[PDB]
Swiss-Prot record, chains A, B, C, D:
This is Transient receptor potential cation channel subfamily V member 1. Na(+) 2 binds at G240. Changing S122A: Largely reduces PMA enhancement of capsaicin-evoked currents, but no effect on direct activation by PMA. Loss of activation by capsaicin and loss of vanilloid binding. The chain holds residues 381 to 718 of 838 of the full protein. The modification Phosphoserine is found at S122.
Length: 315, 315, 315, 315
């Protein structure tokens, strides 16, 4: 038996806390949890009770989402907000869900604020990992905005609400951290996004934009002279529905086609495939690292669980 | 020469049987067949006669499938079942195939039952490998259901029948196990399904659903307000036929487009490509393992062949 | 200096000939050319003159193809063959190219026959590598067939001719063997075809067919009840233009959609991506081997060059 | 401290210059910069001031591009050039941007000429790396051509201009060299283009062309008898919008379909996926090499910075 009390020397800073709140700059930020005493301990906690609490929290959240979903689905958008309830069961259910939706939003909002009270946002912006919390804050932000617009007689609230909704469904992935495979997968995802995806987009957009302006220049009208629509037409090539003959409003057919071909080859063929290639390599490079991260991710959850859960007695 | 009689000590449990019916939990479940005596023996059996019997069984099965296929293809769906045969050759052929189809269904059904009598279904559910047998059971199940509905005057039997049909064509892959390459390939397939595919879908569906509700919320009508149709519209982006302008029923064009773009980027671009990447890695990780499994798969077939085939005399 | 006369002991069998015409069963079939004396010699030959002759032959062939192409492009398909020339330059050019096309066909045909006179076709069928020659034979075969049909007053000759044409354009790749990169690439191609592609298709078609019959069964008419058209509709999903709502001729909408979804997921998503994954691994496995093969491929060409080219004096 | 004055012995040739202008044939062309003294020095320069100048130059360039873009976007193509300005703010802004666009074109043109005065174009053609400069020259070339055509009353100038525009947006990637990741990515891109992409296209086009002529031969008319349109129809299969039933103008439906299927399988399925596979391997092979190259790329920029920037005093 290891002297676990050392870890729990929170009077200064628990060993686990040191790790959990370690700066992204720390070399062993993840590697520190390779210690057998720490793993023994954390796994014990997880199985002993934390995962139960965790699953519960997840369950609650997914309920929140379907409640919110329904509220939006049956939302009487006809007219301007706020809307007057009528004496029906459906109306009762709607406003019930509506209220609950807002409540949960406030809950997450406030928690985000708590984190800001502790880990100030000037610090949080430096942790592209803590974003997993920030996203809930943003989600709730959209909720709150829609509340304002709703009571401001601004139907625009729908849009804000919708963004909140989508955010939540994205945020569902947060809870994959409770599974040594799903959470790992999620880690793979977030890293590839932060790396390869944005790397790709940086260039993708350059070509998208460049070619769209090239084409527009040639275009006389056809409702494609509007850059907005032309760039969408080019975008369509990369989703797989780009029409080479989308317009005839030009005197330079050959040139028009040439540009399209270049765009396709460079973007649709080359870059998209390249992306895949690089992604494969990124996977190779990570692998174990995602597992390392996942363990950390879970550990953090564990600590927060105990910290927030009434300081419940334990070993 | 090795003392092969040891292997054949079935009075307690044959060495090969030990392996064949080994729990999925066994560490060497597959590795046990790396023994030269076992391989010598099994390969001998295979070449000596088993593969001939196997090929025959395959042949019979593929006949079954085309018979069943034809029966369905020329099925007089006009009216309600059961249908009355007329004095024609085509009618004769139809009912002939129909009967045969049912018969083969019962055959597989019963065999599945036999397996349940031995390897109880409470055990079978724990072997995500024994599913190769279960699928035949399910196939036959659909057959039997269609029989009931047919005689119940319920045209719905067609649907059940169709599922049986499709199941069978899928189940054709069962017999790839007789080839050291096709069966191996099949192993690669089933593992990637059980791993990467379902892993992917778990998240794919989250985004699909989330975004579909987001969009529906914005939608006023256009026959897209129905979640069902909207989620299909989003699904279309991933097959390659998603229309960015599928509807105009909203007051928030910009937002509408934003959501679509997010969905595409996250799902169509990122996740689908990621999947490919991970699949490549999975292939790397397996490779030899699929071969190991294939050998086991064949060995099992061999044992069952001898066991079921009249206990035919052998070495 | 190595005693090169040993290699040239053709009175029994040249060392290079031994290798060139080595059975596919030979373990070192390709590895034998790793000998420094052989490489020294072969590279010398290549640079000294063979590659010049080779480039010439290529040049001639590509001329043949464009001549043939033009003949077909401007072919007066109106009416029935044989067609009567009129006193015009275009007619003169057409028949000129036509004759030349046939001539070159006969040339390749005859060469194929020569190979059969030597390396009998009973042997050739065992060399899935010698197909590089066979393809020219097949190409010429189609040519000859079209000649017959042409003079038989059968417009069907066009179809045969077209196949010959396509064959030739495919056969253009033959000459990539003169470049240590293009030929290597071609080797990568042919191996992946012979391996992964046909492996894939074996299963692809199973699902294609199976699902198509499933769907047809549900279909009442709509011109999709014809299996032929339905299977094409399913095929379209894998090229990227499959319509989930291609028909409404059924009483089981839900089921109809279910089947489509299964087909997409299993075939479009899973198998196609899997194929990519496996292809990547195949590339890894080959790499050097394709280079080895390429060297052999070139060596063979070299030997044939000298053998056919007037037995021109050399070192 | 290393004796840095040795590096600066430019009276003969600076050590860095030796490397920077090293022939592509040099074995250590890139490896030479692995020297710790060189890296120390170059990194110092970069951070000390070069990167600031570099960022500035980039900034200027991106301004140039958006100015040019706007000029084209609001270009009164109605009638024939040169166009007469009217007394409006928009006209003033247009011609302002127009002039600026030409000016920057001349700037890059002249610089290209300067390089030709030094590193003669007979040499430049041998450096498929120096193309990064050539592209600016080509960009400016198109600009100058449009100027001529503009004043020649030839509306065709638009086309030339458009090409210049697109070139510039492509050339934006030049400046990714200032980032150890973006520039590296760009290196990955250019290599894969120069290698795999053109390798692919070499064969892709063979099949594209071959099959297009095959199909045309069958075609009676339908506006597809024109090879140009048919080859586009085939091209569409690879972008994901190829229609199997694009025409009915033929007497050989079966054959028509067969050809299409072959084209799809060989090109759309096989080759495109193969390309991806090879690309993955190319990534594996490069990796570090791209980083090496990137460092060189930056070093070159550094040297040119100092050389062109007033010979500003330094260590």
């Amino acid at each position: 038996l290891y002297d676990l009390s050392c870890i729990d020397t929170c009077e200064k800073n628990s060993v686990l806390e040191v790790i959990a709140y370690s700066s992204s700059e720390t070399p062993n930020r993840h590697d520190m949890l390779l210690v057998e005493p720490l793993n023994r301990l954390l796994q014990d906690k997880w199985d002993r009770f934390v995962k139960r609490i965790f699953y519960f929290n997840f369950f609650v959240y997914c309920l929140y989402m379907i409640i919110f979903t329904a509220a939006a689905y049956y939302r009487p958008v006809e007219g301007l907000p706020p809307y007057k309830l009528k004496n029906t069961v459906g109306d009762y259910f709607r406003v019930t869900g509506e209220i609950l939706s807002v409540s949960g939003g406030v809950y997450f909002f406030f928690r985000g604020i708590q984190y800001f009270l502790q880990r100030r946002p000037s610090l949080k912006s430096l942790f592209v990992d803590s974003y997993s919390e920030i996203l809930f804050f943003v989600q709730s932000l959209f909720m709150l905005v829609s509340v304002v617009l709703y009571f401001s007689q601004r139907k625009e609230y729908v849009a804000s609400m919708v963004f909140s909704l989508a955010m939540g469904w994205t945020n569902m992935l947060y809870y994959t951290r409770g599974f040594q495979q799903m959470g790992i997968y999620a880690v793979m995802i977030e890293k590839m996004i932060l790396r390869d995806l944005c790397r790709f987009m940086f260039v993708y957009l350059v070509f998208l934009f460049g070619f769209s302006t090239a084409v527009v220049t040639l275009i006389e009208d056809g409702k494609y002279n509007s850059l907005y629509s032309t760039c969408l037409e080019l975008f369509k090539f990369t989703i797989g529905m780009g029409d080479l003959e989308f317009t005839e409003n030009y005197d330079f057919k050959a040139v028009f086609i040439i540009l399209l071909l270049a765009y396709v080859i460079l973007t649709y063929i080359l870059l998209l495939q390249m992306l895949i290639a690089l992604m494969g390599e990124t996977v190779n490079k990570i692998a174990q690292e995602s597992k390392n991260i996942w363990k950390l991710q879970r550990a953090i959850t564990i600590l927060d669980t105990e910290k927030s859960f009434l300081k419940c007695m334990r070993k």
